[PDB]
């Protein structure tokens, strides 16, 4: 998208696997604030907001908290308390044309600074003067857009980026969005430390003999005690004996 | 009648402090990139400070912690206010109207700085 | 940072020449260029803006030409109110600040 138009892609309901990104020697910038990126992998979050453009290269510094520029003043602004990630790449080799490639825009004018994530997709005629416009450009009467032109012979300042906000919402309201958290092998007929999809606990684990329902997960005795349990990847039930113990 | 009228300056001793205006007429201050520009004898035009419209403020080094822009919506006046002056601040300081990529369209007649002790 | 290089230092003409004036940007800028008129003690006058664009009220003898690195601004018939000082400028540069040509004056040839 042009910058005045960035493009926002809500995610939700999904298990995000942020090791593709953290990982990747493919980006230039790679800026995080409220938040680790390798230990995202083990948070939960309500939404996830994926916000993309194209801008200057002189004018990825602004997308960041507390700057100020055409961009953060006038296209894309973030908040002062931003909880996300900001990543970029130089993108010279796609979004610019020999003849210069017109398709990517900006605000130019602006009375005042957007509020952070607001989005300006007006044409409106911008007064610059005294004397009203009507829709019609002229003197002191300018369109508010302008085009890059990027040509891809520019230095770098001048060379377009692609960049991606990532925000990380957490609202009072169930979370939809984890992080992968892997599992191991699981040993047999061995007093082992376990914790199962909820439930954690100590004891061995032995194939069962008993006849689990297609929904049933943890079994309980009498006593109110975990007596079974469904592994959650292999469809087997197995039975916690807890490990041998006595006076001395 | 678009045009940019400069007044306050004078000459000075090096540390003092002076306060330029700039008046202007058919161009809204606030509606627009205002920018100062100088240009000191025998040398090339150096940027000085701009305002955005949206308030935005911008120094060029030289003047960074010592000299101040502002604007006054209800006069439509652009201002410099300049303290601990130096002797390499004389120059004549204009006023401009900077419409970026369309170039600067609007400036005014100049007011002339002299700081000496 | 980027540099503009412009040539020649000066030039003389005569009314009616063909004048031509070089600038040069240490690397590519597209478009983003203007071209001014300065006479002594007067403010600069914008003659050409976004490299080949004619301000509003400059007579067509003015005319700029030019994308990426090499640029010119050219009066094809010199007029005696065009005995002045020329220059360019980087548009929106990196960091703040107006990057100006060194300048070319065109005084009178004899």
């Known amino acids: 998208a042009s910058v005045y138009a960035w493009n926002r892609k809500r995610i939700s309901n999904c298990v995000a696997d942020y090791s593709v990104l953290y990982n990747s020697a493919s980006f230039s910038t790679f800026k995080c604030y409220g938040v680790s990126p390798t230990k995202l992998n083990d948070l939960c979050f309500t939404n996830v907001y994926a916000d993309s453009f194209v801008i200057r290269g002189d004018e990825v510094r602004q997308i960041a908290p507390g700057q100020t520029g055409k961009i953060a003043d006038y296209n894309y602004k973030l908040p002062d308390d931003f909880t996300g990630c900001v990543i970029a790449w130089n993108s010279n080799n796609l979004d610019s044309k020999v003849g210069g490639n017109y398709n990517y825009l900006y605000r130019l004018f602006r009375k005042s600074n957007l509020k952070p994530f607001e989005r300006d997709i007006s044409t409106e005629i911008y007064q610059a003067g005294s004397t009203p416009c009507n829709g019609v450009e002229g003197f002191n009467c300018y369109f508010p857009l302008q085009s890059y032109g990027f040509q891809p012979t520019n230095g770098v300042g001048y060379q377009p980026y692609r960049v991606v906000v990532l925000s990380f919402e957490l609202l009072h309201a169930p979370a939809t969005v984890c992080g992968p958290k892997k599992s191991t092998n699981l040993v047999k007929n061995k007093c082992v430390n376990f914790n199962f999809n909820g439930l954690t606990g100590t004891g061995v684990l032995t194939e069962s003999n008993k006849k689990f329902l297609p929904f049933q997960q943890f079994g309980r005795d009498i006593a109110d005690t975990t007596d079974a349990v469904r592994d959650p990847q292999t469809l087997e039930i197995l039975d916690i004996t807890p490990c041998s113990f006595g006076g001395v | 009648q678009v045009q940019l009228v400069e007044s306050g300056g004078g000459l000075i001793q090096p540390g003092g402090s002076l306060r330029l205006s700039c008046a202007a007429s058919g161009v809204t201050v606030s509606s627009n990139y205002m920018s100062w520009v100088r240009q000191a004898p025998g040398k090339g035009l150096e940027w000085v400070s701009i305002?955005?419209?949206?308030?935005?403020?911008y120094y060029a080094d030289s003047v960074k912690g010592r000299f101040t822009i502002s604007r006054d919506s209800s006069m439509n006046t652009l201002y410099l206010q300049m303290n601990s002056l130096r002797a390499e601040d004389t120059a004549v300081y204009y006023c401009?109207?900077?419409?970026?990529?369309?170039?600067?369209?609007?400036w005014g007649q100049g007011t002339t700085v002299t700081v000496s002790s | 940072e980027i540099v503009m290089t412009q040539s020649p230092s000066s030039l003389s003409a005569s009314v009616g020449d063909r004048v031509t004036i070089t600038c040069r940007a240490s690397?590519?800028?597209?478009?983003?260029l203007a071209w001014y008129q300065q006479k002594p003690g007067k403010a600069p006058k914008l003659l050409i803006y976004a490299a080949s664009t004619l301000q509003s009220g400059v007579p067509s003898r003015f005319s700029g030409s030019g994308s990426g690195t090499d640029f010119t601004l050219t009066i094809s018939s010199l007029q005696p109110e065009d005995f002045a000082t020329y220059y360019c400028q980087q548009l929106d540069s990196y960091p703040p600040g107006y990057t100006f040509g060194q300048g070319t004056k065109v005084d009178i040839k004899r």
């Open positions: 401009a109207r900077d419409l970026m990529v369309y170039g600067i369209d609007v």
């Open positions: 690397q590519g800028i597209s478009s983003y």
């Open positions: 305002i955005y419209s949206g308030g935005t403020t």
